[PDB]
Amino acid sequence: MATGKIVQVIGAVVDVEFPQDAVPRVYDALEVQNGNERLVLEVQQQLGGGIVRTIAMGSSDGLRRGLDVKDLEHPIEVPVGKATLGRIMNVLGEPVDMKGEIGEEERWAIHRAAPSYEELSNSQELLETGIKVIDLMAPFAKGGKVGLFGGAGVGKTVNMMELIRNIAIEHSGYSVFAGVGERTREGNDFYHEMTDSNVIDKVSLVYGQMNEPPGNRLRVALTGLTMAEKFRDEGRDVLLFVDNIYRYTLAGTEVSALLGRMPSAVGYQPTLAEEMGVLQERITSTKTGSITSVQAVYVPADDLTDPSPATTFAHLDATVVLSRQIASLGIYPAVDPLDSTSRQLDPLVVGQEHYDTARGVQSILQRYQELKDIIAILGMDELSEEDKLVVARARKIQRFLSQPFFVAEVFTGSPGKYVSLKDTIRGFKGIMEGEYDHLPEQAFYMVGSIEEAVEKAKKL
Amino acid sequence: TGKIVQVIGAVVDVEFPQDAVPRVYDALEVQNGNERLVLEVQQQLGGGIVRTIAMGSSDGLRRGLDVKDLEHPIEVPVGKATLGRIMNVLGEPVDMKGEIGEEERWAIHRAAPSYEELSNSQELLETGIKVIDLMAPFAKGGKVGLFGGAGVGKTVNMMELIRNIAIEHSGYSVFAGVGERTREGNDFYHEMTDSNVIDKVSLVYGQMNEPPGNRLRVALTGLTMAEKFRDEGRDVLLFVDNIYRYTLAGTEVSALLGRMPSAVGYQPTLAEEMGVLQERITSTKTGSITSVQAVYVPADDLTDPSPATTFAHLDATVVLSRQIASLGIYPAVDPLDSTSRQLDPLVVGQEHYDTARGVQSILQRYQELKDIIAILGMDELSEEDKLVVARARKIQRFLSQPFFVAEVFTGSPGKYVSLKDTIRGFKGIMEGEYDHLPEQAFYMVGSIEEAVEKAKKL
Amino acid sequence: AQAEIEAERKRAREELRKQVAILAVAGAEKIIERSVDEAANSDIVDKLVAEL
Amino acid sequence: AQAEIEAERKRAREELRKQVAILAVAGAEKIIERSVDEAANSDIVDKLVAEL
Amino acid sequence: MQLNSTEISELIKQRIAQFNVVSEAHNEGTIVSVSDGVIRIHGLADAMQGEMISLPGNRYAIALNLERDSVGAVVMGPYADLAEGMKVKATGRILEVPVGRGLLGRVVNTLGAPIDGKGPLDHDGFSAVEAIAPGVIERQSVDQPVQTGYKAVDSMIPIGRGQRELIIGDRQTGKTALAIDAIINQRDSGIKAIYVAIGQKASTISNVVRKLEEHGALANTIVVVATASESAALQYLAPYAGAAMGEYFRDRGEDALIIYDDLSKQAVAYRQISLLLRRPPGREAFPGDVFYLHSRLLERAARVNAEYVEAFTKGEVKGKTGSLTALPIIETQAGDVSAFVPTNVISITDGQIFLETNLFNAGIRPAVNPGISVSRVGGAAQTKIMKKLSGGIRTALAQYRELAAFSQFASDLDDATRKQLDHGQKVTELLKQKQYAPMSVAQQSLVLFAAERGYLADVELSKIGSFEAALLAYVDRDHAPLMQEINQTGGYNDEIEGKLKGILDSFKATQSW
Amino acid sequence: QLNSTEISELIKQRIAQFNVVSEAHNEGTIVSVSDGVIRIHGLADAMQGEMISLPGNRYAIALNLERDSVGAVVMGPYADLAEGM
Amino acid sequence: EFITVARPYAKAAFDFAVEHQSVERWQDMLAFAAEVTKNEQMAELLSGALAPETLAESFIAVAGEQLDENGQNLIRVMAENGRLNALPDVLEQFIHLRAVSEATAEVDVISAAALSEQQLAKISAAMEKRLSRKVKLNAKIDKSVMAGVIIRAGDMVIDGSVRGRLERLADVL
Ligand SMILES: Nc1ncnc2c1ncn2[C@@H]1O[C@H](COP(=O)(O)OP(=O)(O)OP(=O)(O)O)[C@@H](O)[C@H]1O
Ligand SMILES: Nc1ncnc2c1ncn2[C@@H]1O[C@H](COP(=O)(O)OP(=O)(O)OP(=O)(O)O)[C@@H](O)[C@H]1O
Ligand SMILES: Nc1ncnc2c1ncn2[C@@H]1O[C@H](COP(=O)(O)OP(=O)(O)O)[C@@H](O)[C@H]1O
Ligand SMILES: [Mg+2]
Ligand SMILES: [Mg+2]
Ligand SMILES: [Mg+2]
């Protein structure tokens, strides 16, 4: 029964005093009436005698010192399995789509340990995305983790929408989408996009929404993982999309000062690497089933030094870096080839044909970046005629990596293109050799295949 | 009635009987050896403790001294009785003359005028100074700020504005010395007395010499006199010798007042403390205040919070650059950073507005070329780029001017330049009317006629 | 307009001197929760004429 | 200029309301205190202890 | 006239008729300290967080720290008269503001008391200052225009009804000018305006309200003020007071445009409150929840689907979708976007417009940097005519700036390059525009059609300014039926391209620049 | 002014018999649990870097010996530990 | 003020006094230990830096009345943590705990006149209905109250004064 009492409210953080023999366990849920509305608190710390420090899963407004608190002897438990499909839920696993009760058969705690070392798998089966720069420079594998890094406004969302279109419709299996810290507008537009394209029955959606109190954002990512882990343990192969991992860390930073921790580094909580590792280490493919995941990563001010993006780089398998320096030129997808990379890019998977083609492209673009400094002051007439030819063919390859997406027609006004891996390799070889030395630079820009870059040159 | 219970630098804690605790901003009084010390109440702590700032030196204070509770704030003389006299933060006479023939005293803590009371005006006020009323002209009843680092010309420029404005203007004026040099107060007083203009000027001085509490409050003493003359229905000129010192004296006490540090260690209240001072310096439907303020910029860092907050308060801002001053171009105004609310085609009219934007465009383009020129040298430029540079350099020189107050330094006689001569002059340079003169012809010449006479003798 | 409304302003002040007497007793009768034929009306009219 | 005076119209009415109310309650304090009665005071207590 | 004052002396007696003598019961505390606008209160066992606490006089405080054995609260007004041992009563109330159509053309403070002196408010009741936004299932996609009237913004960086668009830049770059021109241009669009002034000087507000009154714009606008003189809690809370007024229109099927000015200063006021309450400082000395401060503010601006309106209005209004559009303003210190407050607000919004000093000094005004500015709604916000033409403009113009750098010491210029650098200079010149001079859809469309079909290409660059002025003048006298067609429809077809082709061909032959 | 392990039942123990040093130095009780750190009351014979055995065959390393308590860091999962163990 | 640091001790002393059925003595005992704390010379010693034990035993010596091994040991605990100046706030909280445990409230009643006593019989009977506790009255006559009465109980107030109701009515500008 109701047996704790509230003893402080400061911002999002609530202290509750229980009797000394019935103190709640860490990560237990607690329940209180905030007027008409029922509110849930999650226990973070046991401190002093009988007192526990907690985060509110909802607004603190209207709490009083003295309110009676009921002790639920379990952590936050969420519905899992097929009942979730086609539904939108909040962090507490409550329906927020008006469609009615979820109708579950099972509920799982959102806090659980990672797979043990004996359970992991290394099944690096190559996966085709249809995006030139990704499939060449940073090839995916089934069951791997992919990160889309970038600062604000660089194309993380529309890249993820393109990846969702190409693999996730083809995948023939269930998907989870975690809207951690997402904009409510874009969460709505995604829900209608999946409904109108009639694939919403394959996918279950958990949304955090930015607006929500700090507590919701911190835990909505674990709710998304717990549904994906249920489908994995069934033995299914699932796709997990996460709309921003950074905002999970930033939600920890908000409460961390109020939870009495002293600060570290650039204001981040001291626990940053522990909190990141505990989440990321659940997103893995075991011997029973595989989880393939794509995560967007906010990079504050595009400073890839910053501890939050710098820490996550170690947990991924392919990392795609989107740069504002490229995006300033409008040349989307804005993937930087000299910074993007993948564990799968070696001859023992890719074969030598693909490996040689990717290493070739990197070496040309690296060389051109040095030549580009000479030109800006001494002028291109001052170069070797070999270096002048490298500058030309590099500046073409830079444009040929661009590709219009049929999730971006509203921005471009133009028809989106898909490319096979086979056609992608042949095109880059053709610029590295002589076959297209005679086309202008603008004849490559947002083209599609090489086989139609000649056509834009004829139009140009 | 009260007892002193702590003394920490400028801050003194006093305990009172709990039925009798002083209000905030009440004046208290304590005998410190052979003198009387005023304390101003800042905070009420619990239990009848009250925390206060000493309006004088706090050395020699014991614990356990008896403190007297004065029932009122700090109140200062106002009106014509103050004209022609030098007064202290406490409103005491500091010249050797007798007592001030006050009829009324006003509390230095006041509310700003209501939104209904404010008045607009677009009457352009002319100055002697080519760059200022070209690039950043200002109106009667507006606020001007001179921003600059140490030793760049804030005082000399304000002394020309006093010479030019405050002697062709006919009404009263108030000069507030806030945390600046005592020598320069004495030098100013005399030339006012030597010129017999002193009898139109009230002067309040709280120089660097003084303890923190004086430097903090003395600005409010100055405004309170200017507000009396404004409410009487006059048009008044207020000069503030360095507004930055008000914020700095807040920084010095804020930690002793027990407030967590903010930003670059500033007090957390920095924007409110500045705003509550600044909002009182406004012209009103009853009467007008024209204000010129010097604004020291610490470490030349214009992005420091204290400069940064001041910029939103002001109608014209003139920014002084050490990089220009070390050329010896004076006044060292940066025309790419100086700006005014009055540089608008409707109030100035089109010829002035077009001339100012032309000058701004050529000088911006000269900044864009300077990184080429530094590595390559000029010979690589295009023949139009060379003409942009050749004009910009003449423009930079022609913004220089001899000042009547600066004659003691350059020897050369000062110049007063009519606005019409400035517009005609810069318009001719940008049109190339003068492309045949050397750069030296333009340096430190009052008007464009004087450039051509200087050019004849190179 | 300023001259016109200042004429109306002094005229309104005269009539409301009667109306505000009625206000004071109506407030008092609700505040005391009971009607009251109070005797010392000298105190009403003294304030009524002196402050207005 | 005409709409301005009909704004000004509302400002003049509201300022007179404020005056008469505050001088009305100032009269009411004098009027009620001088008209205190022990039966009426007891009747206050007898009301509030009935609803309390 | 003033005998109506005498009639409402009977209305003063009607207050007595409505008044009630009943004894309430309430919870009580004493002020135990007073400093810098913060008070500590002992007692108030039943105080709630975010509750209004009532003080001697008609003054209030907001309860923010409910610690054990004391409440910490901030005073919504001048604090210096408060003293230790004053009694204080806890109401039941959250903070509410007057709201309704009557507000339009009024200047009010953050509590909603009028300060223009135009007499009392007329209003349609009160609404809570703090409120949760419409959830995912309650929204509708943004697909209608709100017109800026600026060639640069409406072509390159389109704003749709229900978007949040950050205006960002250094001091004195035209941040406010852009936003009040966006207000002025709504004078006839049907969209209501709210201007929220946080921490500005009162004479600057009085000047902007004057310009709104020289134009027709003030009658359509609410002005909410918290000047630099007012307490740190009146600010901080002002944006929320403005949003509560904008939401009234949003939830009845009307469009509102709300300009929060200097959201940065809202953050500075909130830092003052947090440090005086001794909450732990985070990065750059702001509190950590400063993201939650702005994100919950800005996520209120939304377009809601018709079902949500019908439910809110209880069937009074059916079939209408309501929208609130927010245009927050941030000041950067030196173009440094990496500061904590700019990085938070850039994270939240649906795009940004960067204004910058180098362009402004070069005379590119409005100083919109095409490269780092972006709209995340994009073409779905435009009319089809602008959509068709403008998509080409912004990315071409960005690449012109790259090409112009690489060119800067190249002497031979290939004809593709020579054409591009030429076209890009002529488009850069075309997008300059004078303040307070907004352009209709048909005027913008016609001028873009001149650029994207190459009618500018031969014209000498300083004349491009006079070319545009002469073209607008010519078409308004001779071809106004098409201007009405385009402004009303926004339509585009082969006959529209043909009629515009005919107009450009006819102008460029017959007239003079 | 703030509390340093001043908790009601520990205080009540001392009032009854102040000389609680009569109980063995070998053992103690957890009085706080957070973020993988525990604070222990007792363990008067603990030493720097010593292994403390926890329920579930777990260990913590004693890293702060403070005047009233030991601060120790849990070498494993910690989230099920509770005060009074 | 000491309130927050005094709470843990006040509970423990009351809990202990309940088990040993000595609450009355403990109250009279804490009342002495608070009073020695107020003496000047004793106060100086408490603000001094004497090591806990040497401070405690010099305190315990003056507190001769204190029950040895119970009251005197409570001092040793507070001396380890330097809370001795909190003793006036460790008391009163002990009295508050006692009054809660005894289900009894002091309640206060302020009026323009000495209330009629018959009225107090009604008021006490009403307060024993509003709150389920025995209610000690200690009413007051006050000049400020124009007429009527204030009832104050804990931190809840029921204003029945004409002063309050006028200044409640004067509100409606
Ligand atoms: N117009 C000028 N002509 C010649 N010299 C000048 C001029 N302006 C400034 N100077 C030189 O700079 C010196 C300092 O100027 P000023 O005292 O006004 O500096 P400031 O900005 O007030 O410095 P501080 O912050 O130290 O008060 C002058 O003594 C003079 O040597
Ligand atoms: N389109 C324009 N063309 C010409 N001048 C303009 C234009 N827009 C703004 N200005 C001018 O720029 C100056 C500053 O504009 P504004 O006050 O909007 O800048 P701001 O960034 O708001 O300044 P602050 O940082 O002080 O608020 C004003 O003199 C204004 O007249
Ligand atoms: N592939 C693309 N094609 C066209 N425009 C794009 C592309 N990627 C990004 N953009 C532009 O950048 C904007 C923001 O990118 P988006 O991914 O929505 O933001 P974020 O990268 O922060 O998630 C888009 O609205 C669009 O204007
Ligand atoms: Mg994004
Ligand atoms: Mg100086
Ligand atoms: Mg502005």
First-to-last C-alpha distance (Å) of chain E: 58
Same domain, A328 and A349: no
Q: Which residues have CB under 8 Å from A196's CB, separation 6+?
A: none
- The DSSP code sequence of A73-142 is SS--EEE-SGGGTT-EE-TT--B-SSS-----S-EEES--PPPPGGGB-----EE--S-HHHHHHS-EET
Cα–Cα dist G83/G90, whole Å: 9
- β-pairing, B27-31 vs B86-87, is unpaired
C-alpha A155 to ligand 3 mean position (Å): 4
Residues A289/A117, Cβ–Cβ less than 8 Å: no
Give Rg (Cα) of chain B. Answer: 25
Reading the block at residue A86, the tokens are: 């086609």
| CATH number for the domain that contains residue G85 | 1.10.520.20
Helix intervals (H) in E215-337:
238-250, 263-276, 290-298, 306-313
Instruction: Dump the DSSP string for E98-136.
Output: E-SGGGTT-EEETT--B-S-S-S---S-EEESS-PPP-G
Burial B389-404 (b: 16+ CB within 10 A, else e): bebbebbbbbbbbbbe
How distant is the Cα of G65 from the closest Cα of chain D, in angstroms?
A: 46
**Short-list A91, A113, A93, A109, CA closest to A101:** A93
Q: How far apart are CA B81 and CA B434, in angstroms?
A: 55
Q: Are A265 and A307 in contact (CB under 8 A)?
A: yes
E432: which 2 tokens?
Answer: 């300059």
Total domain count for chain A?
3
Q: Is the previous residue joined to B331 through a cis bond, with omega within 30 degrees of 0?
A: yes
Contact D11 E119 (CB under 8 A): yes
Q: Same domain for A362 and A448?
A: yes
Q: E274 phi and psi, to 5 degrees?
A: -70, -40
- Select from E15, E23, E28 the Cβ nearest to the Cβ of G155: E28
Helix axes G162-169, C2-31, angle to 10 degrees: 150
Q: What is the largest CA-CA distance in chain G?
A: 66
Q: Which of B51, B85, B143, B154 is catalytic?
A: B154
Q: Residue B20: which CATH number? A: 2.40.10.170
Task: Name the phi and psi angles at E45, rounded to 5.
Answer: -55, -30
Contact status of A353 with chain E (Cβ, < 8 Å): no
Closest CA in chain C for residue E18: C30
The torsion angles phi and psi of B34, rounded to 5 degrees, stand at: -120, 25
B180 is catalytic: yes
- Cα dist from A432 to A365, A368, F56, whole Å: 11, 13, 63
Kindly state whether residues A187 and A293 are assigned to the same domain: yes
Q: Report the b/e string of B118-128 with b at 16+ CB within 10 A.
A: beeeeebbbbb
**In sequence order, what DSSP letters do the residues of A225-279 get, joined into one string?**
HHHHHHHHHTT--EEEEES-SHHHHHHHHHHHHHTTPPPBTTTB-TTHHHHHHHH
Rounded Cα distance, B394 and B109, in Å: 50
Cβ contact A79:A107 at 8 Å: yes
Contact present, E127 and E242 (Cβ < 8 Å): no
Q: Which helix (H) or strand (E) holds E118?
A: none
Nearest CB to A211 within list E45, E133, E371:
E133
- Alpha carbon distance, N-terminus to C-terminus of chain F: 29
Amino acid identity, residue E109?
N
Determine the structural domain holding residue B274 and report its residue range.
74-342
Q: Say whether both A152 and A30 belong to one domain.
A: no
Q: Match 């309170």 to its residue by tokens.
A: B224
Pair B131, B335: CB distance under 8 Å: yes
Name beta bridge partners: E42. E30
Give the end of a domain, one of A298, A324, A344: A344
State the residue for tokens 């500005």: E200
The verdict on A50 and A99 lying in the same domain is no
Residue B76 CA to residue B91 CA, distance in Å, equals 5
CB B136 within 8 A of CB B143: no
The DSSP element (H or E) to which B132 belongs, if any, is helix B130-135
Per the CB < 8 A criterion, the answer to whether B176 and B240 are in contact is yes
Q: For chain D, give percent helix, strand, coil, nearest 5.
A: 90, 0, 10
Strands A318-321 and A145-150: parallel
Which stretch of DSSP H or E encloses residue B295? strand B288-296
Neighbours of B105 (CB within 10 A): 16
Could you give the maximum distance between any two Cα atoms of chain C, in Å? 46
Name beta bridge partners: A87.
none
Cβ–Cβ < 8 Å for A341, A136 = no
**A120/A249 same-domain check:** yes
Q: What structural domains and CATH numbers belong to chain F?
A: 2-85 (2.40.30.20)
The candidate with the shortest Cα–Cα distance to A187, out of A161, A166, A213, is A161
Q: CA-to-CA distance for E144 and E141, rounded, in angstroms?
A: 9
Q: Please check whether residues A146 and A271 belong to one and the same domain.
A: yes
Question: E223, E229, E216: which is closest to E188 by C-alpha?
Answer: E216
DSSP designation for B59: T
Same domain, yes or no, for B305 and B351?
no
Q: What is the β-pairing status of strands A238-242 and A175-179?
A: parallel
**Roughly what angle, to the nearest 10 degrees, separates helices D2-34 and G162-169?**
170
A49 & A86 share domain:
no
Contacts of G21 (CB under 8 A, 6+ apart): none
Q: Is A114 annotated as a binding residue?
A: no
B106 is written with which tokens? 């006003």
**Residue range of the domain that includes G88:** 3-101
Task: Specify the experimental method.
Answer: cryo-EM
Cα–Cα distance, G66 to G33 (Å, whole number): 8
- What's the distance, Cα to Cα, between the start and end of chain D in Å? 58
Distances (CA, A) of A151 to A132, B143, B376, E163: 22, 41, 36, 20
Kindly tell me the burial class for residue A261, based on how many C-beta atoms sit within 10 Å of its own C-beta (0-12, 13-18, 19 or more): middle
Residue E347 touches partner A, C-beta closer than 8 Å: yes
Q: How far apart are CA E220 and CA B437, in angstroms?
A: 57
Give the ligand with the smallest distance to the CA of E431: 2
Ligand 2 pocket check for E185: Cβ under 6 Å: no
Does B92 lie in the same domain as B58? no
Task: Encode B244-267 in three state secondary structure.
Answer: HHHHHHHHHHHCCCCCCCECCCEC
* Ligand 4 center–CA A244 separation, angstroms: 8
CATH number at residue A142: 3.40.50.300
- The answer to whether C and D touch (≥3 CB pairs < 8 Å) is yes
Angle, vertex CA A245, rays to CA A205 and CA A88, nearest 5 = 10
Resolution of the deposited coordinates, in angstroms? Answer: 3.1
Residue A261 contacts by C-beta under 8 Å, 6 or more apart in sequence? A269, A270, A271, F35
Reduced to 3 states, what is the DSSP secondary structure of residue F58?
A: strand
Same domain, B56 and B84: no
Residues E436, E442, E447, E452, Cα dihedral to 10°: 140
Any residues with CB less than 8 A from the CB of A228 and at least 6 apart, and which? A176, A238, A240, A283, A291
Distance CA E239, CA A426 (A): 57
Say whether the A–C interface has 3 or more Cβ pairs within 8 Å.
no
CA distance A281 to chain E (A): 27
Residue type present at position A190: F
Same domain membership, residue B296 and residue B155: yes
Distance CA E23, CA E34 (A): 30
DSSP β-ladder status, E26-35 and E166-169:
unpaired
Any binding-site annotation on B171? Answer: no
Residues E175/E208, Cβ–Cβ less than 8 Å: no
Ligand 1 mean position, distance from CA B147 (Å): 13
Question: To 5 degrees, how large is the angle CA G82–CA B45–CA E226?
Answer: 135
Distance CA A195, CA E300 (A): 25
Pairing mode of beta strands B143-148, B288-296: parallel
CA distance linking residue E475 with residue E496, whole number of Å: 14
Pocket test for ligand 2, best of E176, E181, E201, E354 (most atoms within 8 A of CB): E176
Pocket probe for ligand 2: among E172, E180, E210, E361, the residue whose CB has the most ligand atoms within 8 Å is E172
DSSP state of A173: S
